[PDB]
């Protein structure tokens, strides 16, 4: 359960954003991708898996998951296979959007804001994920 | 102090540009292929890093992609103050290279191997332990 992520897609300005959420902490990694294809989804999960100890990823099971490429990357990496969260992220992107020319930049500012915001001695998602994983390591 | 310190270096393979960010205290790395070694692409890479980890200081090589405005603007916004590892990553990339059509894929397989290999703990374990401790 320290190892469980949910992967969802979300759409803005005609562009495709994948969002991975660490379920236990609410920490997110998100990026604009050129298209919602098995290959691009597989690349996104390989990146995630090198960064965090990802054991299970829950997906929407649509078209980009029926092929071989995501399955091949998850097998290699050892990975087994909140619409509120897309709404919260889009809210933050709208608040920084005019600060960046490119949507991709705005997305990353939004990930930064989401992961570092302190809602109170009451931690950020970034603090919550490191605390959850470090506790489990020992 | 050294929980928040990263070093950023560039490295080159197959005519393509790879940025590597190393968390100095743990040896954990984030790396990716970028289109070109420009201020803009460098700034994007640092903005991504800074949303993922609590980055306070990043040591760079201070060359051409750092003289302009964008990297400075991303670091200001994110609150960031301004080659054995390239050789090791390249070693790992060559061992997995034939398994991927694209260099970018091989790079990420290499980051995965580097960060997860057992050395007691892996780099991935080391970084989370260092940062969790620092949180009090």
């Amino acid at each position: 359960s320290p190892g469980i992520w949910q992967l969802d897609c979300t759409h803005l300005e005609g562009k495709v954003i994948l969002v991975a959420v660490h379920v236990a902490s609410g920490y997110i990694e998100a990026e604009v991708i050129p298209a919602e294809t098995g290959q691009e989804t597989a690349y996104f999960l390989l990146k995630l898996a090198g960064r965090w100890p990802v054991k299970t990823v829950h997906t929407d099971n649509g078209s980009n998951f029926t092929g071989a490429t995501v399955r091949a990357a998850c097998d290699w990496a050892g990975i087994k296979q909140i619409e509120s969260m897309n709404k919260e992220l889009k809210k933050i992107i709208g608040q920084v959007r005019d600060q960046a020319e490119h949507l991709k930049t705005a997305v990353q500012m939004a990930v930064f804001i989401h992961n570092h915001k302190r809602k109170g001695g009451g931690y950020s998602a970034g603090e919550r994920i490191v605390d959850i994983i470090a506790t489990d390591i020992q | 102090s050294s929980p928040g310190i990263w070093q950023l270096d560039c490295t080159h393979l197959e005519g393509k540009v790879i940025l590597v960010a190393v968390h100095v205290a743990s040896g954990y790395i984030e790396a990716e292929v970028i289109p070109a070694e420009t201020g803009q692409e460098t700034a994007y890479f640092l903005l991504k890093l800074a949303g993922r980890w609590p980055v306070k200081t990043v040591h760079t090589d201070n060359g051409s992609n750092f003289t302009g405005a964008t990297v400075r603007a991303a670091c200001d916004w994110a609150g960031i103050k301004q080659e054995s590892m390239n050789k090791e990553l390249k070693k790992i990339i060559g061992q997995v290279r034939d398994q991927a059509e694209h260099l970018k894929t091989a790079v990420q397989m290499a980051v995965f191997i580097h960060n997860h290999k057992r050395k007691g703990y892996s780099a991935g374990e080391r970084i989370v332990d260092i940062i969790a401790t620092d949180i009090q």
Partner: peptide, 6 residues
Amino acid sequence: PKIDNX
């Protein structure tokens, strides 16, 4: 003028 360009 924006963060990433101009």
